[PDB]
Design a protein around this ligand. Structure first.
Ligand SMILES: O=C(O)c1c(Cn2cccn2)ccc2c1OB(O)CO2
Length: 242
């Protein structure tokens, strides 16, 4: 069920980095990680919370489909991609916080709390500001717990409609070619220590699917590219991608 492979530490070492990668082989039902303790510690989800928050908003009508437009409110913010109109697709891709804060207001916390207990998401706790608990409130989740939630979403087993789950999976699309497909979501948590980055999702092959969840220390914005680079080094060492 779970094996530790400390050879993968070489990939964090050679980049002067600390973190964890967790993998799950769905055909064989086997899990793998470089550090079993950190794999099972809880952190703020940050922008990886955009997956469940999308699901809830669609199932309630706040978002009607993936073409509906959320136009720029005219307030200039330090991230430049955020100062333009978006839909569900581009708002996931550029991690556009103020679009999703507006959703959370619309949903309100009786219904947000209800959906998270139904989802069995993390510690299920939404203490703090209705529109920022995932960035500086009481909600926490581990890498192994990210994997269990994502497996339900892959199999359409969450207690929302099939249509909602299909639309969110479309909007998670990150990479594809003749060898693999990746559906995933980035996160960057900087408001409460420790600053960390996330990348969670899966790799679809012709005949199997490998779920993944990673996080790593991130004192400076300069190492954000390492989230994907280290993850792909593990995948290649294990012969999952070329
Ligand atoms: O890593 C994030 O997703 C991300 C980034 C960087 N980034 C966006 C797309 C790829 N990288 C910047 C700000 C931010 C972010 O997520 B959240 O946790 C909210 O704020």
């Amino acid at each position: 069920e779970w094996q530790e492979n400390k050879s993968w530490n070489a990939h964090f070492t050679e980049h002067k980095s600390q973190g964890v990668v967790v993998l799950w082989n769905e055909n064989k039902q086997q899990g793998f990680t470089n550090n079993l303790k950190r794999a099972n510690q809880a952190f703020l989800p940050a922008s990886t919370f955009k997956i469940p928050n999308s699901l809830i908003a669609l199932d309630l009508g706040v978002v009607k489909d993936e073409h509906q437009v959320f136009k720029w409110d005219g307030q200039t913010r330090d991230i430049a991609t955020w100062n333009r109109d978006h839909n569900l697709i581009t708002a996931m891709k550029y991690s556009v916080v103020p679009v999703y804060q507006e959703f959370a207001r619309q949903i309100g916390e009786a219904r947000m709390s209800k959906m998270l207990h139904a989802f069995d998401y993390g510690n299920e706790d939404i203490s703090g500001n209705v529109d920022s608990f995932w960035l500086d409130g009481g909600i926490r989740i581990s890498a192994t717990e990210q994997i269990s939630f994502l497996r339900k979403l892959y199999h359409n087993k969450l207690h929302v409609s099939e249509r909602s789950q299909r639309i969110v999976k479309q909007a998670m699309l990150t990479e594809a070619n003749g060898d693999y497909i990746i559906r995933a979501k980035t996160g960057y948590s900087t408001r409460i220590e420790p600053k960390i980055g996330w990348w969670v999702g899966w790799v679809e092959l012709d005949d199997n699917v490998w779920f993944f969840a990673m996080n790593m220390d991130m004192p400076t914005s300069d190492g954000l590219g390492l989230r994907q680079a280290i993850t792909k080094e593990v995948l290649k060492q294990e012969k999952i991608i070329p």
